[PDB]
Amino acid sequence: HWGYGKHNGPEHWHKDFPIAKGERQSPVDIDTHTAKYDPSLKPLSVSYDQATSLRILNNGHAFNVEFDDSQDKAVLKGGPLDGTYRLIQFHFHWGSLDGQGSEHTVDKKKYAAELHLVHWNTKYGDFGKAVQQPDGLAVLGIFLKVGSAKPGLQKVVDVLDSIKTKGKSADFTNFDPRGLLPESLDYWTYPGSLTTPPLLECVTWIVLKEPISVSSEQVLKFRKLNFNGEGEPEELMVDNWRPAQPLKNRQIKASFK
Ligand SMILES: CC(=O)c1ccc(B(O)O)cc1
Numbered sequence: 022h023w024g025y026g027k028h029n030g031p032e033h034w035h036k037d038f039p040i041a042k043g044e045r046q047s048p049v050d051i052d053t054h055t056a057k058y059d060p061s062l063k064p065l066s067v068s069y070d071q072a073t074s075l076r077i078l079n080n081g082h083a084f085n086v087e088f089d090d091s092q093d094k095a096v097l098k099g100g101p102l103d104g105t106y107r108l109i110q111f112h113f114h115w116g117s118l119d120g121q122g123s124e125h126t127v128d129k130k131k132y133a134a135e136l137h138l139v140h141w142n143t144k145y146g147d148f149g150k151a152v153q154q155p156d157g158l159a160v161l162g163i164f165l166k167v168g169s170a171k172p173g174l175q176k177v178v179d180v181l182d183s184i185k186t187k188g189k190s191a192d193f194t195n196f197d198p199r200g201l202l203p204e205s206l207d208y209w210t211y212p213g214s215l216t217t218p219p220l221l222e223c224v225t226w227i228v229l230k231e232p233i234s235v236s237s238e239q240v241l242k243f244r245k246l247n248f249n250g251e252g253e254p255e256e257l258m259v260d261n262w263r264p265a266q267p268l269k270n271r272q273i274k275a276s277f278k
């Protein structure tokens with residue numbers, strides 16, 4: 022199917038997913054000097070106190086920490102969102118080297134990796150119904166650079182040997198995603214889509230300005246994962262990011278000056 026190589030990478034996705042050439046695709050480059058501070062923006066509200074993680078999965082594209090979204094336990098509201106968005110899963114995209122990996126860029130700058138905290142609007146009932154709506158999803162993007170170690174990430178780094186190949190999964194309860202958040206909630210926001218197929222244009226993107234630091238060893242463990250499935254030729258899971266897409270008829274708002 023689709024992947025990230027030279028034969029199935031992003032530049033090929035449009036053949037099986039025409040919306041790849043859509044009018045509100047992600048990711049995009051964030052021109053910090055062209056984004057306009059928006060007063061009407063309300064303060065962001067991250068209520069992850071009752072978050073309940075369940076499993077960690079290698080899907081052959083990335084690895085998802087999945088949560089129990091059967092109740093309003095870890096929600097995202099305020100900011101540009103109208104209503105309540107339930108956290109369903111979070112994933113990363115990283116590069117083969119520290120100077121790449123992120124999907125969004127800031128003034129064309131690429132980060133070592135990008136963390137996506139995915140939530141879906143609770144007025145749609147579930148995630149599968151929510152992805153079919155223009156305001157069905159809210160994704161919290163957080164950049165990752167190499168530097169100091171991010172303690173709240175080590176628990177995820179330690180379990181990755183259990184999900185090395187596509188399809189493998191492992192119990193992963195009691196993970197607190199608040200350890201993955203940066204100090205500040207300053208953000209840019211814009212209307213976009215999922216960054217992998219089906220590339221549905223259903224996402225409100227909230228990208229935090231302040232990155233989180235991770236050690237080179239923490240990301241190195243990311244690079245030891247496998248695209249392939251067990252017993253198959255080893256393709257290392259690296260550079261699983263979509264490059265910046267055309268901004269088109271969109272303006273990026275900022276929550277700060
Ligand atoms: C297919 C799917 O479930 C998914 C795809 C991309 C993202 B993202 O851009 O944050 C999240 C979820």
Ligand SMILES: [Zn+2]
Pocket residue numbers: 112114137216217
């Ligand atoms: Zn993603």
